[PDB]
Design a protein around this ligand. Structure first.
Ligand SMILES: [Cl-]
Ligand SMILES: [Cl-]
Ligand SMILES: [Cl-]
Ligand SMILES: [Cl-]
Length: 124
């Protein structure tokens, strides 16, 4: 089984690009990160920052997770993000996504030793 930390990396980290360069970014990335394997993951955010910069959020602004738990942290600064969301028509196994690039704060749930991101809660 994948570790919670490795699963966060695979689903949320895109340190290789500064931003989504086309409308097809999400179709490509949802596929290459194995988020369309058995079903279409409806919503997924990729972060265009270093792994170190995203891990560092776990010692930034402590906030509530939307589930009401208290191991969530908001980034002090904005980050380059891409929101991926299934289109209204999308049907497995022809998953189709809308790509939205933005600069926003990220909120992540952190856990473990080392204390690292295990869930992407939201971007603000
Ligand atoms: Cl790991
Ligand atoms: Cl995988
Ligand atoms: Cl997400
Ligand atoms: Cl958690």
């Amino acid at each position: 089984k994948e570790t919670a930390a490795a699963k966060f990396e695979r689903q949320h980290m895109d340190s290789s690009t500064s931003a989504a360069s086309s409308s097809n970014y999400c179709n490509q990335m949802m596929k290459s990160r194995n988020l369309t394997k058995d079903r279409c993951k409806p919503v997924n955010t990729f972060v265009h920052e270093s792994l170190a910069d995203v891990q560092a959020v776990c010692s930034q602004k402590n906030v509530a997770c939307k589930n009401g738990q208290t191991n969530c942290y908001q980034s002090y600064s904005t980050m380059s993000i891409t929101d991926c969301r299934e289109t209204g028509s999308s049907k497995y196994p022809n998953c189709a996504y809308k790509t939205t690039q933005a600069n926003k704060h990220i909120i992540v749930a952190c856990e473990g030793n080392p204390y690292v991101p295990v869930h992407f809660d939201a971007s603000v």
